[PDB]
Amino acid sequence: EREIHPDTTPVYDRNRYVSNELSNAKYNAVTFVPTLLYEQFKFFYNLYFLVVALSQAVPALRIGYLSSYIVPLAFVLTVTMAKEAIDDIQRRRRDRESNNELYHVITRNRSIPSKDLKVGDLIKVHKGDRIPADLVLLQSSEPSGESFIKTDQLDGETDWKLRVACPLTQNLINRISITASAPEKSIHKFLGKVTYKDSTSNPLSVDNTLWANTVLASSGFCIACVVYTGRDTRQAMNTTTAKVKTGLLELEINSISKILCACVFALSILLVAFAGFHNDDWYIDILRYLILFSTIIPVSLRVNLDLAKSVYAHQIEHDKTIPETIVRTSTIPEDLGRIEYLLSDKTGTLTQNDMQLKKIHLGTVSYTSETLDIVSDYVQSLVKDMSFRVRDMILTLAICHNVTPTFEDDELTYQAASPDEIAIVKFTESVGLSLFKRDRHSISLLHEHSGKTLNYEILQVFPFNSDSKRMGIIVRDEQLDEYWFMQKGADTVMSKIVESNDWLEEETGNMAREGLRTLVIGRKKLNKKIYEQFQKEITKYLEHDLELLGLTGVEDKLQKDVKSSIELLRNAGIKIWMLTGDKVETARCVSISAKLISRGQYVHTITKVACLLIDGESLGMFLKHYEQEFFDVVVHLPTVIACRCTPQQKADVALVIRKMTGKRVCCIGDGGNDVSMIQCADVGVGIVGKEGKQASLAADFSITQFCHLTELLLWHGRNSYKRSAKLAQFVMHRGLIIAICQAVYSICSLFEPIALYQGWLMVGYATCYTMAPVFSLTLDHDIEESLTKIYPELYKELTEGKSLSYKTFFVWVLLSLFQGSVIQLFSQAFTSLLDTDFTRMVAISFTALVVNELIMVALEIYTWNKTMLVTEIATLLFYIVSVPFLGDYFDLGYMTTVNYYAGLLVILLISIFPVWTAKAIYRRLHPPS
């Protein structure tokens, strides 16, 4: 229940109803810190360095500088708050750029923005303008009182919906009371009542209402009253609340961080047990050693990950090959690189929503958009037999339809609830015989060409019906006075009823193999007496025997490079589905034309109360009851195609895919009917370029068309995941190698592992001397963007998870064991460990560590930019010139010795030769392609 008086401004303006302001931002000022801190310190690899930093509050676990465990905690906090604060303010900016659209109010007498709009203000909404909210039509410009709303972004439909004005109020200006029902999720239902003076209640239904993101057509203006606004709209109530999205690589790093924590705890317990359980405080010893060993990985890993994600977002949204792309969730730029299931969409996403009669065929010959001059000079002769057949074909095309034309200064406009008829009439005017003035209530039609304006008053029309697949007319010519029966329809229905032709089925199948929506057309000459016998009066008499004029091939235009995009996304192992709110037949035609369904490849179909093609109710019931069995059936099919899908159904399909397989689900679309599919995905991609952009606003990414998703997945996300995995590898390697050097020094000399690197040296290793070459790895790629099309199978090589797994983590751990043991033990061997050779020993150990990391960085580079050859030399020279001036106390030594440099050469060659030879033999055994 909801009662609306158009004139009582204060009662709705001040309160009682939601404002039209829509919000995409997640965190407000009051709950920006608690929510972000809570959802950031749920995982282990964050809570771990938080506990490491909080350990030093107790004045017994102090390992070193307080300027080393609290300033990187403040740095990770600063970076996190900055990133999500920038994300929220950018979301607010993007959302307010579409909350300021100007709409004219009857009472306010001035154009006001959409957010200023409330419930119950009469908007004079015009033709090409996007509908503001859930409107109810109280008056229409046309005397009939009907207009064609356009819901390609309310649901996935491609036809125009005939919405009539309220018949009691379309003549009226006076104030008219509305009383609607409470808002629901029913996108195809409406229950309201229009109340006038003297208690005259009237019915309202879906046929006299406009909704949130519809676009008007078939008028010049119309007066409509807002009923549902803001979050009470049918659009915003078919949407589930968005949740935070943690990447898969985040989970992998969390798991390997858990195992790393277990490893360093075991190493610390081993160190203390080997010491001898002395000092009367063994628990303090194991805790202090654990803090020592686990304070260089868990916090450097986070800063490296966060700044790498920022770099990935900047690289994505600054690509010339993908213009005008926007990253709206910067926390997951690497889920794009491991996507196994793609949930695409048809209307706007795949198609241009612009159908056009591509091909006409008759008498075993065909005309196309190419060579339209021949058919033009054929029709211009209206005022051997092939010319007459073509002329009568064109006449039947231009008369049999249900298209309403209306006039401007020029560029006459067509208005039909079936846009294939609009494509037909546009084709006829392009050939030369144009539709003009049509009554459509009385009996009249006007048609002018290069000659004289004809006229054909209709005699009867049989409306198009969903169970009939036919549109038939009886028409009377003015000039020649001839009764004609003209019918167009589907192949399956008119094939048995048109004639005894010999060539229908072949050409119908031939063009249906190209995804053309074919309609066959037949003609029957009539005289008067049979017509008055007909008018004496079920459907048997009206269709007896026709003559096949020909058939029409109407294509649904696809977006730029859709078939190639689908071919390469399936060549990379991504199983493209296609869920749509449109009709079954148009979905099948788009699937065949886009080669989502290839040659042959029999298609099954389900409609309940190889390939697949299922209705919405059938899929909903199947996922409600038969989850596991049906889903295990469908995962082996190449493509599953769904039709008539509620947004909840697409969201549930994405949820079921990411739950029953544990794979990552991308979901591309546009318009608000696939917002839930986008928010409940693991990656949400939106598309812009038309009147509606509301799915791109709520999405995680945004691209201008469908061709851009190929390079958004195959090159940007794949590189993002690869670079993040290699970054985690190198950070954990440097932390583990310093931990191993300290542990080897502790076993070889019973003092402490803490007493090896004290003061400046440990801080400099953690931050100054090592952090730049990892971000050097952040800017590396194996194959260029120009060759991400030729090699889609590279996207298949990341399918297993052979980059961040337990096996490769333990390979890193074993490499760290080997190299740290070599560094520490050869340092002890060359420096002859005592209490006076400690400085030289720690000097050679630290220099070996630094150069070892800088060589291991330079070993794992595919292509060398100039932003990586300089950030290694910069750090190496910083270490070289940072020994005397900033150190001088720690690790002091002579270092101007020929034997020292040979010892360093040996201690580094033994550490970097296994890695180099392993990658050499692995490159000579498994060449890449």
862 within 8 A of 879, measured Cβ to Cβ: no
| DSSP three-state, residue 827 | helix
CB < 8 Å & 24+ apart, contacts of 115-119: 115/19, 115/20, 115/21, 116/20, 117/20, 117/226, 117/229, 118/12, 118/13, 118/17, 118/19, 118/20, 118/226, 118/229, 119/2, 119/4, 119/12, 119/17, 119/226, 119/227, 119/228, 119/229
Could you tell me the smallest distance in angstroms from the CB atom of residue 687 to Mg ion? 9
Q: Which of 346, 401, 716, 734 binds ligand ALF (CB under 6 A)?
A: 346
Q: Which residues lie across from 641 on neighbouring strands?
A: 578, 613
Q: Which residues lie across from 209 on neighbouring strands?
A: 136
**Annotated binding residue 421:** yes
The sign of the CA dihedral 893, 897, 901, 902 is negative
Q: How far apart are CA 173 and CA 167, in angstroms?
A: 15
CA distances 156 to 34, 345, 578, 614, 653, Å, are 39, 8, 12, 15, 16
What H or E segment, with its residue span, contains residue 578?
Answer: strand 575-579
**Residue 684, interface with Mg ion (CB under 5 A)?**
no
Place of tokens 């950031």: 40
Could you tell me the smallest distance in angstroms from the CB atom of residue 157 to ligand ALF? 8
Closest to Mg ion by CB, 652 or 674: 674
Binding part of the chain for Mg ion, among 126-134, 376-384, 666-674, 848-856 by CB under 5 A, reads 666-674
Q: Which of 120, 333, 581, 753 binds ligand ALF (CB under 6 A)?
A: 581
Q: Which does 346 bind (CB under 5 to 8 A by kind): Mg ion, ligand ALF, none?
A: ligand ALF
Binding part of the chain for Mg ion, among 173-181, 503-511, 671-679, 872-880 by CB under 5 A, reads 671-679
**Residue 556, interface with ligand ALF (CB under 6 A)?**
no
Q: Which does 420 bind (CB under 5 to 8 A by kind): Mg ion, ligand ALF, none?
A: none
**Annotated binding residue 99:** no
**Residue 692, interface with Mg ion (CB under 5 A)?**
no
Closest to Mg ion by CB, 257 or 694: 694
Q: Which of 304, 349, 646, 720 binds ligand ALF (CB under 6 A)?
A: 349
Total of residues contacting ligand ALF (CB under 6 A):
12
Q: Which two tokens stand for residue 151?
A: 């819901």
Closest to ligand ALF by CB, 343 or 822: 343
Q: How far apart are CA 188 and CA 103, in angstroms?
A: 26
**Annotated binding residue 44:** no
Binding part of the chain for ligand ALF, among 261-269, 671-679, 836-844, 855-863 by CB under 6 A, reads 671-679
Q: How far apart are CA 639 and CA 570, in angstroms?
A: 10
Residue 446 phi, psi dihedral angles, 5° rounding: -120, 140
What's the number of CA atoms in the CB half-sphere (13 Å) around residue 408?
A: 9
CA distances 136 to 124, 617, 645, 876, Å, are 12, 28, 25, 71
Closest to ligand ALF by CB, 146 or 159: 159
Q: How far apart are CA 161 and CA 182, in angstroms?
A: 23
Please report the DSSP string for 783-811 in residue order: S-GGGTTT--GGGGGGSS--SSSHHHHHH
Closest to ligand ALF by CB, 345 or 429: 345
Closest to Mg ion by CB, 348 or 432: 348
Q: How far apart are CA 522 and CA 488, in angstroms?
A: 6
**Residue 213, interface with Mg ion (CB under 5 A)?**
no
Could you tell me the smallest distance in angstroms from the CB atom of residue 556 to ligand ALF? 11
**Residue 315, interface with ligand ALF (CB under 6 A)?**
no
**Annotated binding residue 674:** yes
| DSSP three-state, residue 635 | coil
**Annotated binding residue 345:** yes
Measured at CB, which residue is nearest to ligand ALF? 156
What residues act catalytically? 345
319 within 8 A of 712, measured Cβ to Cβ: no
Binding part of the chain for ligand ALF, among 297-305, 580-588, 816-824, 845-853 by CB under 6 A, reads 580-588
Q: Which does 753 bind (CB under 5 to 8 A by kind): ligand ALF, Mg ion, none?
A: none
Binding part of the chain for ligand ALF, among 610-618, 666-674, 842-850, 919-927 by CB under 6 A, reads 666-674
**Annotated binding residue 469:** yes
**Annotated binding residue 21:** no
Could you tell me the smallest distance in angstroms from the CB atom of residue 697 to ligand ALF? 16
Could you tell me the smallest distance in angstroms from the CB atom of residue 212 to ligand ALF? 14
Q: Which two tokens stand for residue 334?
A: 């690497």
Q: How far apart are CA 337 and CA 630, in angstroms?
A: 28
Q: Which residues lie across from 875 on neighbouring strands?
A: none
**Residue 671, interface with Mg ion (CB under 5 A)?**
yes
**Residue 616, interface with ligand ALF (CB under 6 A)?**
no
Q: Which of 120, 132, 156, 616 binds ligand ALF (CB under 6 A)?
A: 156
Please state the residue numbers annotated as binding site for ATP. 345-347, 421, 464, 466, 469, 488, 517-518, 580-582, 644, 650, 673-674
Interacting residues toward ligand ALF by CB under 6 A: 156, 345-349, 580-582, 671, 673-674
Annotated binding site for Mg(2+): 345, 347, 670, 674
